[PDB]
Design a protein around this motif. Structure first.
Motif, mmCIF file in Angstrom:
data_model
loop_
_atom_site.group_PDB
_atom_site.id
_atom_site.type_symbol
_atom_site.label_atom_id
_atom_site.label_comp_id
_atom_site.label_asym_id
_atom_site.label_seq_id
_atom_site.Cartn_x
_atom_site.Cartn_y
_atom_site.Cartn_z
ATOM 1 N N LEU A 59 0.685 -1.205 -0.181
ATOM 2 C CA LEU A 59 0.076 -0.112 -0.093
ATOM 3 C C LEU A 59 1.081 1.294 0.235
ATOM 4 O O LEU A 59 1.710 1.516 0.773
ATOM 5 C CB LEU A 59 -0.857 -0.010 1.103
ATOM 6 N N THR A 66 -4.187 11.532 5.873
ATOM 7 C CA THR A 66 -4.644 9.958 5.297
ATOM 8 C C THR A 66 -3.546 8.943 5.981
ATOM 9 O O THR A 66 -4.194 7.956 6.413
ATOM 10 C CB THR A 66 -4.189 9.944 3.831
ATOM 11 N N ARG A 69 -4.796 8.631 9.750
ATOM 12 C CA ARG A 69 -6.051 7.975 9.949
ATOM 13 C C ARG A 69 -5.946 6.463 9.643
ATOM 14 O O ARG A 69 -6.475 5.585 10.178
ATOM 15 C CB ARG A 69 -6.975 8.488 8.902
ATOM 16 N N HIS A 70 -4.882 6.220 8.721
ATOM 17 C CA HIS A 70 -4.705 4.578 8.372
ATOM 18 C C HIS A 70 -4.219 3.976 9.385
ATOM 19 O O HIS A 70 -4.360 2.751 9.954
ATOM 20 C CB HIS A 70 -3.888 4.697 7.005
ATOM 21 N N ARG A 73 -6.662 3.595 12.004
ATOM 22 C CA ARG A 73 -7.650 2.413 11.986
ATOM 23 C C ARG A 73 -7.074 1.311 12.202
ATOM 24 O O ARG A 73 -7.630 0.280 12.601
ATOM 25 C CB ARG A 73 -8.360 2.591 10.738
ATOM 26 N N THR A 74 -5.864 0.871 11.616
ATOM 27 C CA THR A 74 -5.113 -0.355 11.665
ATOM 28 C C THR A 74 -4.725 -0.601 13.036
ATOM 29 O O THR A 74 -4.365 -1.857 13.202
ATOM 30 C CB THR A 74 -3.991 -0.628 10.637
ATOM 31 N N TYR A 78 -8.523 5.033 17.047
ATOM 32 C CA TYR A 78 -9.592 5.721 16.412
ATOM 33 C C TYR A 78 -10.802 5.757 17.073
ATOM 34 O O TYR A 78 -11.989 5.775 16.538
ATOM 35 C CB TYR A 78 -9.524 5.196 14.977
ATOM 36 N N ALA A 85 -15.150 7.995 16.747
ATOM 37 C CA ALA A 85 -14.434 8.183 15.745
ATOM 38 C C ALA A 85 -14.759 9.594 15.049
ATOM 39 O O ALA A 85 -13.664 10.338 14.590
ATOM 40 C CB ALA A 85 -14.599 6.990 14.760
ATOM 41 N N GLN B 84 -9.944 -1.982 5.062
ATOM 42 C CA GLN B 84 -9.135 -1.036 5.393
ATOM 43 C C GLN B 84 -8.163 -0.208 4.528
ATOM 44 O O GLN B 84 -8.153 0.867 4.289
ATOM 45 C CB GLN B 84 -8.182 -1.660 6.725
ATOM 46 N N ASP B 95 -8.766 13.996 0.894
ATOM 47 C CA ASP B 95 -7.698 15.002 1.398
ATOM 48 C C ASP B 95 -7.464 15.708 0.218
ATOM 49 O O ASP B 95 -7.115 16.862 0.127
ATOM 50 C CB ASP B 95 -6.784 14.298 1.888
#
Ligand SMILES: [Ca+2]
Lengths: 208, 210
Positions: A59, A66, A69-70, A73-74, A78, A85, B84, B95
Protein backbone atom coordinates in the motif's frame (compact mmCIF):
# COMPACT_ATOMS: atom_id res chain seq x y z
CA UNK A 1 6.94 -2.86 7.85
CA UNK A 2 6.59 0.89 7.21
CA UNK A 3 8.51 3.45 5.16
CA UNK A 4 8.09 7.23 5.38
CA UNK A 5 9.56 9.33 2.58
CA UNK A 6 10.09 12.98 3.46
CA UNK A 7 12.43 15.95 3.66
CA UNK A 8 14.82 16.13 6.62
CA UNK A 9 12.37 18.09 8.77
CA UNK A 10 9.71 17.32 11.38
CA UNK A 11 6.89 19.10 9.57
CA UNK A 12 3.88 17.03 8.55
CA UNK A 13 5.58 13.76 9.59
CA UNK A 14 6.25 14.68 13.22
CA UNK A 15 2.88 13.46 14.47
CA UNK A 16 2.87 10.15 12.57
CA UNK A 17 6.43 9.50 13.79
CA UNK A 18 5.43 10.10 17.42
CA UNK A 19 2.51 7.73 16.87
CA UNK A 20 4.74 5.01 15.42
CA UNK A 21 7.35 5.40 18.17
CA UNK A 22 4.83 5.48 21.02
CA UNK A 23 3.07 2.43 19.58
CA UNK A 24 6.32 0.46 19.45
CA UNK A 25 6.22 0.25 15.66
CA UNK A 26 9.30 -0.02 13.44
CA UNK A 27 9.87 2.00 10.28
CA UNK A 28 12.35 3.10 7.65
CA UNK A 29 13.11 6.77 7.00
CA UNK A 30 13.93 7.61 3.39
CA UNK A 31 15.30 11.15 3.44
CA UNK A 32 14.80 13.31 0.35
CA UNK A 33 17.22 16.20 -0.12
CA UNK A 34 16.35 19.58 -1.61
CA UNK A 35 18.65 18.63 -4.48
CA UNK A 36 16.84 15.35 -5.16
CA UNK A 37 13.45 17.08 -4.92
CA UNK A 38 14.44 19.83 -7.35
CA UNK A 39 15.47 17.19 -9.91
CA UNK A 40 11.73 16.76 -10.43
CA UNK A 41 11.31 13.04 -11.06
CA UNK A 42 10.32 11.97 -7.54
CA UNK A 43 7.87 14.87 -7.27
CA UNK A 44 6.26 13.94 -10.59
CA UNK A 45 5.66 10.37 -9.37
CA UNK A 46 3.80 11.61 -6.26
CA UNK A 47 0.01 11.61 -6.54
CA UNK A 48 -0.42 15.29 -5.59
CA UNK A 49 3.19 16.30 -6.24
CA UNK A 50 3.93 16.34 -2.51
CA UNK A 51 5.60 14.42 0.30
CA UNK A 52 5.19 12.65 2.66
CA UNK A 53 4.85 9.39 0.82
CA UNK A 54 4.15 6.35 3.00
CA UNK A 55 4.48 2.62 2.36
CA UNK A 56 2.65 -0.07 4.31
CA UNK A 57 3.63 -3.23 2.48
CA UNK A 58 2.15 -2.99 -1.01
CA UNK A 59 0.00 0.00 0.00
CA UNK A 60 1.29 3.44 -0.98
CA UNK A 61 -0.27 6.52 0.60
CA UNK A 62 0.07 10.28 0.31
CA UNK A 63 -1.32 13.08 2.56
CA UNK A 64 -0.23 13.29 6.20
CA UNK A 65 -3.76 13.02 7.61
CA UNK A 66 -4.50 10.01 5.39
CA UNK A 67 -1.45 8.31 6.91
CA UNK A 68 -2.55 9.24 10.44
CA UNK A 69 -6.06 7.87 9.88
CA UNK A 70 -4.70 4.69 8.30
CA UNK A 71 -2.45 3.98 11.28
CA UNK A 72 -5.31 5.00 13.56
CA UNK A 73 -7.67 2.50 11.96
CA UNK A 74 -5.16 -0.35 11.67
CA UNK A 75 -3.64 0.06 15.16
CA UNK A 76 -6.90 0.84 16.96
CA UNK A 77 -6.26 4.53 17.66
CA UNK A 78 -9.57 5.83 16.33
CA UNK A 79 -11.94 5.80 19.31
CA UNK A 80 -14.01 2.99 20.81
CA UNK A 81 -16.97 3.31 18.44
CA UNK A 82 -18.38 5.30 15.51
CA UNK A 83 -19.48 8.17 17.73
CA UNK A 84 -15.97 8.57 19.15
CA UNK A 85 -14.41 8.21 15.68
CA UNK A 86 -16.39 11.24 14.52
CA UNK A 87 -15.14 13.21 17.53
CA UNK A 88 -11.58 12.11 16.71
CA UNK A 89 -12.01 13.41 13.16
CA UNK A 90 -13.48 16.67 14.44
CA UNK A 91 -10.41 17.25 16.62
CA UNK A 92 -7.95 16.30 13.88
CA UNK A 93 -9.60 18.55 11.29
CA UNK A 94 -9.37 21.35 13.85
CA UNK A 95 -5.69 20.60 14.43
CA UNK A 96 -5.17 20.56 10.65
CA UNK A 97 -6.90 23.94 10.31
CA UNK A 98 -4.53 25.59 12.78
CA UNK A 99 -1.57 23.73 11.26
CA UNK A 100 -2.42 25.23 7.85
CA UNK A 101 -2.44 28.71 9.38
CA UNK A 102 0.88 27.94 11.09
CA UNK A 103 2.41 26.71 7.83
CA UNK A 104 1.16 29.79 5.94
CA UNK A 105 2.80 32.01 8.56
CA UNK A 106 6.11 30.14 8.57
CA UNK A 107 6.55 29.86 4.81
CA UNK A 108 4.82 32.92 3.31
CA UNK A 109 4.44 35.70 5.91
CA UNK A 110 6.60 35.17 9.00
CA UNK A 111 8.11 38.61 9.60
CA UNK A 112 4.98 40.68 8.93
CA UNK A 113 2.36 38.23 10.20
CA UNK A 114 3.82 36.84 13.43
CA UNK A 115 2.42 39.59 15.67
CA UNK A 116 -1.18 39.15 14.51
CA UNK A 117 -0.80 35.37 14.58
CA UNK A 118 0.42 35.27 18.19
CA UNK A 119 -2.30 37.72 19.27
CA UNK A 120 -4.91 35.44 17.69
CA UNK A 121 -3.41 32.22 19.09
CA UNK A 122 -5.26 32.02 22.43
CA UNK A 123 -8.60 32.03 20.60
CA UNK A 124 -7.29 29.25 18.35
CA UNK A 125 -6.13 27.05 21.25
CA UNK A 126 -9.16 27.49 23.51
CA UNK A 127 -11.30 24.96 21.60
CA UNK A 128 -8.87 22.19 22.54
CA UNK A 129 -8.89 23.21 26.22
CA UNK A 130 -12.70 23.17 26.08
CA UNK A 131 -12.74 19.69 24.55
CA UNK A 132 -10.43 18.43 27.29
CA UNK A 133 -12.61 20.07 29.94
CA UNK A 134 -15.60 18.10 28.61
CA UNK A 135 -13.81 14.72 28.62
CA UNK A 136 -13.11 13.23 32.06
CA UNK A 137 -11.92 16.61 33.34
CA UNK A 138 -9.12 16.57 30.79
CA UNK A 139 -7.38 13.76 32.66
CA UNK A 140 -7.19 11.19 29.85
CA UNK A 141 -7.09 11.99 26.12
CA UNK A 142 -8.63 14.44 23.67
CA UNK A 143 -11.38 11.93 22.85
CA UNK A 144 -12.56 9.08 25.06
CA UNK A 145 -10.46 6.94 27.39
CA UNK A 146 -7.81 5.77 24.91
CA UNK A 147 -5.19 7.50 22.80
CA UNK A 148 -6.08 8.29 19.18
CA UNK A 149 -4.16 9.58 16.17
CA UNK A 150 -5.66 13.00 16.92
CA UNK A 151 -3.76 13.08 20.23
CA UNK A 152 -0.38 12.75 18.51
CA UNK A 153 -1.32 15.40 15.96
CA UNK A 154 -2.60 17.78 18.65
CA UNK A 155 0.50 17.19 20.79
CA UNK A 156 2.77 18.13 17.87
CA UNK A 157 0.66 21.21 17.16
CA UNK A 158 1.04 22.32 20.77
CA UNK A 159 4.78 21.59 20.96
CA UNK A 160 5.61 23.60 17.82
CA UNK A 161 3.44 26.47 19.07
CA UNK A 162 5.30 26.58 22.39
CA UNK A 163 8.43 27.12 20.28
CA UNK A 164 6.71 29.82 18.20
CA UNK A 165 5.16 31.55 21.20
CA UNK A 166 6.66 30.50 24.54
CA UNK A 167 4.08 30.48 27.33
CA UNK A 168 1.09 30.07 25.01
CA UNK A 169 -0.29 27.19 27.11
CA UNK A 170 0.20 28.95 30.47
CA UNK A 171 -3.43 30.14 30.53
CA UNK A 172 -4.65 26.64 29.65
CA UNK A 173 -4.14 24.20 32.55
CA UNK A 174 -5.68 21.12 30.91
CA UNK A 175 -3.62 21.51 27.72
CA UNK A 176 -0.49 22.17 29.79
CA UNK A 177 -0.98 19.02 31.87
CA UNK A 178 -1.95 17.08 28.73
CA UNK A 179 1.33 17.95 27.01
CA UNK A 180 3.30 16.97 30.12
CA UNK A 181 1.38 13.72 30.51
CA UNK A 182 1.55 12.50 26.91
CA UNK A 183 5.17 13.63 26.61
CA UNK A 184 6.03 11.45 29.61
CA UNK A 185 4.77 8.24 27.97
CA UNK A 186 8.02 6.19 28.05
CA UNK A 187 8.37 5.31 24.35
CA UNK A 188 7.27 8.79 23.26
CA UNK A 189 9.50 10.46 25.86
CA UNK A 190 12.42 8.43 24.51
CA UNK A 191 11.64 9.41 20.92
CA UNK A 192 11.20 13.11 21.71
CA UNK A 193 14.59 13.05 23.47
CA UNK A 194 16.32 11.28 20.59
CA UNK A 195 18.56 13.13 18.08
CA UNK A 196 16.34 11.65 15.36
CA UNK A 197 13.68 14.12 16.55
CA UNK A 198 15.75 16.82 18.27
CA UNK A 199 18.31 17.39 15.51
CA UNK A 200 15.72 17.94 12.76
CA UNK A 201 14.41 21.48 12.30
CA UNK A 202 10.64 21.86 12.71
CA UNK A 203 10.30 23.43 9.26
CA UNK A 204 12.30 23.60 6.04
CA UNK A 205 13.11 27.32 5.86
CA UNK A 206 14.91 27.79 9.18
CA UNK A 207 11.95 29.55 10.82
CA UNK A 208 10.01 28.40 13.89
CA UNK B 1 -38.25 14.10 13.57
CA UNK B 2 -35.47 13.41 11.10
CA UNK B 3 -32.31 12.40 12.99
CA UNK B 4 -30.08 14.70 10.93
CA UNK B 5 -29.96 18.48 11.03
CA UNK B 6 -27.77 20.68 8.83
CA UNK B 7 -27.10 24.14 10.25
CA UNK B 8 -25.63 26.43 7.60
CA UNK B 9 -25.82 29.67 5.64
CA UNK B 10 -28.16 29.78 2.63
CA UNK B 11 -25.45 28.56 0.24
CA UNK B 12 -24.30 25.25 -1.21
CA UNK B 13 -20.67 25.66 -0.20
CA UNK B 14 -19.24 23.09 2.20
CA UNK B 15 -22.63 21.39 2.66
CA UNK B 16 -23.27 20.59 -1.01
CA UNK B 17 -21.44 17.25 -1.00
CA UNK B 18 -22.95 15.97 2.26
CA UNK B 19 -26.45 16.97 1.08
CA UNK B 20 -25.89 15.10 -2.19
CA UNK B 21 -24.75 12.12 -0.14
CA UNK B 22 -27.85 12.20 2.08
CA UNK B 23 -30.26 12.67 -0.83
CA UNK B 24 -28.67 9.93 -2.95
CA UNK B 25 -28.80 7.57 0.04
CA UNK B 26 -32.49 8.32 0.61
CA UNK B 27 -31.88 9.73 4.10
CA UNK B 28 -34.08 12.40 5.68
CA UNK B 29 -32.76 15.63 7.20
CA UNK B 30 -33.67 19.10 8.46
CA UNK B 31 -32.12 22.31 7.15
CA UNK B 32 -31.67 25.08 9.70
CA UNK B 33 -30.80 28.30 7.88
CA UNK B 34 -28.54 30.92 9.44
CA UNK B 35 -28.68 34.44 7.99
CA UNK B 36 -25.63 36.68 7.79
CA UNK B 37 -27.43 38.98 10.24
CA UNK B 38 -27.85 36.20 12.81
CA UNK B 39 -24.24 35.16 12.27
CA UNK B 40 -23.03 38.73 12.76
CA UNK B 41 -24.91 38.92 16.08
CA UNK B 42 -22.20 36.55 17.22
CA UNK B 43 -23.77 34.25 19.83
CA UNK B 44 -24.29 31.22 17.58
CA UNK B 45 -20.74 31.64 16.27
CA UNK B 46 -19.41 31.76 19.83
CA UNK B 47 -21.24 28.50 20.57
CA UNK B 48 -19.60 26.73 17.60
CA UNK B 49 -16.51 24.66 18.48
CA UNK B 50 -14.21 26.38 15.96
CA UNK B 51 -16.36 29.46 15.42
CA UNK B 52 -17.65 28.20 12.07
CA UNK B 53 -20.51 26.46 10.28
CA UNK B 54 -21.54 23.89 9.15
CA UNK B 55 -22.84 22.44 12.37
CA UNK B 56 -24.36 18.98 12.05
CA UNK B 57 -26.58 17.08 14.47
CA UNK B 58 -27.04 13.32 14.39
CA UNK B 59 -29.33 12.88 17.36
CA UNK B 60 -27.49 14.36 20.34
CA UNK B 61 -24.15 14.10 18.51
CA UNK B 62 -23.04 17.56 17.40
CA UNK B 63 -20.32 17.82 14.75
CA UNK B 64 -18.39 20.62 13.07
CA UNK B 65 -16.06 20.48 10.01
CA UNK B 66 -17.56 19.40 6.68
CA UNK B 67 -15.12 16.49 6.20
CA UNK B 68 -15.83 15.28 9.73
CA UNK B 69 -19.49 15.15 8.71
CA UNK B 70 -18.68 13.36 5.45
CA UNK B 71 -16.53 10.76 7.22
CA UNK B 72 -19.20 10.24 9.87
CA UNK B 73 -21.92 9.61 7.28
CA UNK B 74 -19.41 7.53 5.32
CA UNK B 75 -18.95 5.34 8.38
CA UNK B 76 -22.58 5.03 9.45
CA UNK B 77 -24.01 4.57 5.93
CA UNK B 78 -21.30 2.22 4.65
CA UNK B 79 -19.69 4.60 2.16
CA UNK B 80 -16.08 4.19 3.31
CA UNK B 81 -14.63 1.31 1.27
CA UNK B 82 -15.02 -2.46 1.60
CA UNK B 83 -11.94 -2.88 3.80
CA UNK B 84 -9.09 -1.03 5.53
CA UNK B 85 -6.98 -0.52 2.39
CA UNK B 86 -9.90 1.01 0.49
CA UNK B 87 -10.73 3.18 3.51
CA UNK B 88 -7.23 4.68 3.30
CA UNK B 89 -7.55 5.29 -0.45
CA UNK B 90 -10.92 6.98 0.16
CA UNK B 91 -9.19 9.27 2.69
CA UNK B 92 -6.37 10.01 0.23
CA UNK B 93 -8.90 11.07 -2.39
CA UNK B 94 -10.92 13.22 0.00
CA UNK B 95 -7.84 15.01 1.35
CA UNK B 96 -6.93 15.79 -2.25
CA UNK B 97 -10.43 17.12 -2.92
CA UNK B 98 -10.18 19.23 0.24
CA UNK B 99 -6.81 20.66 -0.86
CA UNK B 100 -8.25 21.84 -4.18
CA UNK B 101 -11.42 23.08 -2.48
CA UNK B 102 -9.26 25.28 -0.24
CA UNK B 103 -7.57 26.87 -3.26
CA UNK B 104 -10.97 27.32 -4.89
CA UNK B 105 -12.38 28.98 -1.77
CA UNK B 106 -9.34 31.26 -1.55
CA UNK B 107 -9.90 32.29 -5.18
CA UNK B 108 -13.63 32.93 -4.75
CA UNK B 109 -13.50 34.90 -1.51
CA UNK B 110 -10.00 36.42 -1.47
CA UNK B 111 -8.99 37.50 -5.01
CA UNK B 112 -11.36 36.40 -7.78
CA UNK B 113 -10.48 39.23 -10.17
CA UNK B 114 -6.69 39.08 -9.84
CA UNK B 115 -6.27 35.32 -9.57
CA UNK B 116 -8.83 33.63 -11.82
CA UNK B 117 -6.79 33.45 -15.04
CA UNK B 118 -3.81 31.97 -13.20
CA UNK B 119 -6.11 29.57 -11.34
CA UNK B 120 -7.74 28.31 -14.53
CA UNK B 121 -4.32 27.79 -16.14
CA UNK B 122 -3.12 25.79 -13.13
CA UNK B 123 -6.41 23.87 -12.99
CA UNK B 124 -5.62 20.96 -15.36
CA UNK B 125 -2.57 20.08 -13.27
CA UNK B 126 -4.80 20.04 -10.19
CA UNK B 127 -7.52 17.85 -11.73
CA UNK B 128 -5.13 15.35 -13.33
CA UNK B 129 -4.55 13.24 -10.18
CA UNK B 130 -8.26 12.43 -10.01
CA UNK B 131 -8.25 11.37 -13.67
CA UNK B 132 -5.20 9.22 -12.90
CA UNK B 133 -6.95 7.63 -9.91
CA UNK B 134 -9.93 6.84 -12.14
CA UNK B 135 -7.69 5.38 -14.87
CA UNK B 136 -6.21 2.98 -12.32
CA UNK B 137 -9.59 1.79 -10.99
CA UNK B 138 -11.42 -0.47 -13.47
CA UNK B 139 -10.63 1.93 -16.30
CA UNK B 140 -12.57 4.65 -14.50
CA UNK B 141 -15.96 3.06 -15.19
CA UNK B 142 -17.23 2.83 -11.61
CA UNK B 143 -16.20 5.04 -8.67
CA UNK B 144 -13.12 6.90 -7.47
CA UNK B 145 -12.17 4.04 -5.13
CA UNK B 146 -13.23 0.41 -5.53
CA UNK B 147 -16.56 -0.72 -6.98
CA UNK B 148 -18.94 0.97 -4.52
CA UNK B 149 -19.67 4.65 -3.95
CA UNK B 150 -17.93 6.45 -1.06
CA UNK B 151 -18.24 9.84 0.63
CA UNK B 152 -15.20 10.88 -1.42
CA UNK B 153 -17.26 10.42 -4.61
CA UNK B 154 -19.86 12.95 -3.46
CA UNK B 155 -17.17 15.43 -2.44
CA UNK B 156 -15.21 15.00 -5.68
CA UNK B 157 -18.41 15.28 -7.71
CA UNK B 158 -19.26 18.60 -6.05
CA UNK B 159 -15.71 19.81 -6.65
CA UNK B 160 -15.97 18.97 -10.35
CA UNK B 161 -19.44 20.50 -10.70
CA UNK B 162 -18.41 23.85 -9.21
CA UNK B 163 -15.26 23.97 -11.34
CA UNK B 164 -17.29 23.50 -14.54
CA UNK B 165 -19.20 26.64 -13.53
CA UNK B 166 -15.94 28.47 -12.80
CA UNK B 167 -14.23 27.18 -15.94
CA UNK B 168 -16.64 25.79 -18.56
CA UNK B 169 -15.09 22.86 -20.42
CA UNK B 170 -12.31 22.29 -17.87
CA UNK B 171 -13.21 18.58 -17.99
CA UNK B 172 -12.90 18.38 -21.80
CA UNK B 173 -9.26 17.40 -21.23
CA UNK B 174 -10.28 14.58 -18.87
CA UNK B 175 -12.48 11.89 -20.48
CA UNK B 176 -12.82 9.70 -17.37
CA UNK B 177 -13.72 12.59 -15.04
CA UNK B 178 -16.21 13.83 -17.66
CA UNK B 179 -17.96 10.47 -17.96
CA UNK B 180 -17.78 10.09 -14.18
CA UNK B 181 -19.64 13.38 -13.58
CA UNK B 182 -22.31 12.41 -16.11
CA UNK B 183 -22.69 8.94 -14.62
CA UNK B 184 -22.93 9.94 -10.95
CA UNK B 185 -25.15 12.92 -11.77
CA UNK B 186 -27.62 10.53 -13.45
CA UNK B 187 -28.15 8.45 -10.31
CA UNK B 188 -31.95 8.84 -9.93
CA UNK B 189 -32.19 10.18 -6.36
CA UNK B 190 -29.17 12.42 -6.92
CA UNK B 191 -30.40 13.64 -10.32
CA UNK B 192 -33.72 14.57 -8.71
CA UNK B 193 -31.98 16.43 -5.88
CA UNK B 194 -29.59 18.33 -8.14
CA UNK B 195 -32.59 19.50 -10.19
CA UNK B 196 -34.65 20.54 -7.16
CA UNK B 197 -35.27 24.15 -5.96
CA UNK B 198 -33.69 23.12 -2.66
CA UNK B 199 -30.37 22.80 -4.51
CA UNK B 200 -30.76 25.06 -7.56
CA UNK B 201 -32.04 28.15 -5.71
CA UNK B 202 -29.02 28.29 -3.40
CA UNK B 203 -25.92 30.07 -4.67
CA UNK B 204 -22.69 28.05 -4.79
CA UNK B 205 -20.89 30.57 -2.59
CA UNK B 206 -21.72 33.29 -0.08
CA UNK B 207 -20.40 36.33 -1.98
CA UNK B 208 -22.20 36.07 -5.33
CA UNK B 209 -19.13 34.69 -7.14
CA UNK B 210 -18.73 31.38 -8.97
CA1 LIG C 1 -6.75 1.52 21.35
Amino acid sequence: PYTVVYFPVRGRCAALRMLLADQGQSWKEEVVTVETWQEGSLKASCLYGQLPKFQDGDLTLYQSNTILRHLGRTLGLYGKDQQEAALVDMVNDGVEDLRCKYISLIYTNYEAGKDDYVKALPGQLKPFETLLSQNQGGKTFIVGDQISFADYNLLDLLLIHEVLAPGCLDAFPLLSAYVGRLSARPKLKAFLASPEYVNLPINGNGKQ
